[PDB]
Amino acid sequence: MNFPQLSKEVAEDEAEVILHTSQGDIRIKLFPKLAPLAVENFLTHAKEGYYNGITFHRVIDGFMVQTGDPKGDGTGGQSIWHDKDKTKDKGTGFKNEITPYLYNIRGALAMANTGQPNTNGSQFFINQNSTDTSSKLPTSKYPQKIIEAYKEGGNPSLDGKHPVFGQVIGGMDVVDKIAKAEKDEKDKPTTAITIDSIEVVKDYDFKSENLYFQ
Ligand SMILES: [Cl-]
Ligand SMILES: [Cl-]
């Protein structure tokens, strides 16, 4: 099996963005063929300026950093289909796109949501854990190459609950710097860490029917 998170190369069927944050650049490749709703929602919000000035409002070293909330407290954000297309957003967000090809390994980009179905809106997080807990993973559920990948860290308890849609391929040192920022009792950084802009290096057209040789 091919696990697209295990290569830093951007495949022909992948997209690429750079989060230009006040702490540095995070280069991320996206998986529109595996998580089409999460990637379309993210790319459209990015190009529409929805994340310009948005903060990393909650950081936990050894766990993850989360962002994408216009309210800055983890209670806000909407999908691009909210009050536009009920076949995609019934009112609280879009559905989880879980696939056996994407996991919450270190560097994985996933949607936050409330833990209930159809609650993916605009909030997302980057897995930042760097501890090896791979010996506890059931070999009947985790492919051997993914168990190997988890040795570098990740949050496997998030698999199946949080849809993965991207992978950091550059600037993980910036993600670690953000995760260790000085913060208050609610884990909100003392000095705001902002997404100043998102550069779409390689976009993806959801109406494209091009076939790519694998
Ligand atoms: Cl990896
Ligand atoms: Cl769902």
Residue numbers in the entry: 60 to 273
Paper text:
Here, we solved the protein structures of two secreted parvulin and two secreted cyclophilin-like peptidyl-prolyl isomerase (PPIase) ATP-independent chaperones found in gram-positive streptococcal species. Two types of ATP-independent extracellular PPIases exist in pathogenic streptococci: the parvulin and cyclophilin families. Unlike cytoplasmic PPIases, extracellular PPIases have canonical secretion signal peptides that allow for their translocation across the cell membrane via the Sec pathway. These chaperones are lipidated to the outer leaflet of the membrane and function in the space between the bacterial membrane and cell wall.
In contrast, S. pneumoniae SlrA (SpnSlrA) is a functional PPIase and, like SpnPrsA, is also critical for the colonization of the upper airways as well as for invasive disease. We then solved the crystal structures of SlrA homologs from S. pneumoniae (SpnSlrA) and S. pyogenes (SpyPpiA) to 1.88 Å and 1.28 Å resolution, respectively, using single-wavelength anomalous diffraction (SAD) data from selenomethionine derivatized crystals. Models for two chains (A, D) contain all residues of the recombinant protein: an N-terminal methionine, residues 61–267 of SpnSlrA, and six residues of the fused C-terminal His-tag. The SpnSlrA and SpyPpiA proteins have a canonical cyclophilin fold comprised of eight antiparallel β-strands (SpnSlrA: β1, 72–81; β2, 82–90; β3, 112–120; β4, 121–127; β5, 166–173; β6, 181–188; β7, 221–227; β8, 250–260) that form a β-barrel with two α-helices (SpnSlrA: α1,95–108; α2, 230–240) located at the top and the bottom of the barrel. Both structures also contain extra secondary structural elements adjacent to the β-barrel composed of residues 189–212 (η2, 193–195; η3, 203–211; η4, 215–217). To gain further insights into these novel structured appendages/insertions, we utilized AlphaFold3 (46) to model our solved SpnSlrA protein structure and a known tetrapeptide substrate (amino acids AAPF) of the human cyclophilin A. The predicted interaction revealed a model where the appendages interact with the AAPF substrate in a dynamic fashion, suggesting that these appendages may aid in substrate recognition or activity. Using affinity isothermal titration calorimetry (ITC), we determined that SpnSlrA and SpyPpiA bind to CsA with a dissociation constants (Kd) of 122.4 ± 41.4 nM and 365.7 ± 102.1 nM, respectively.
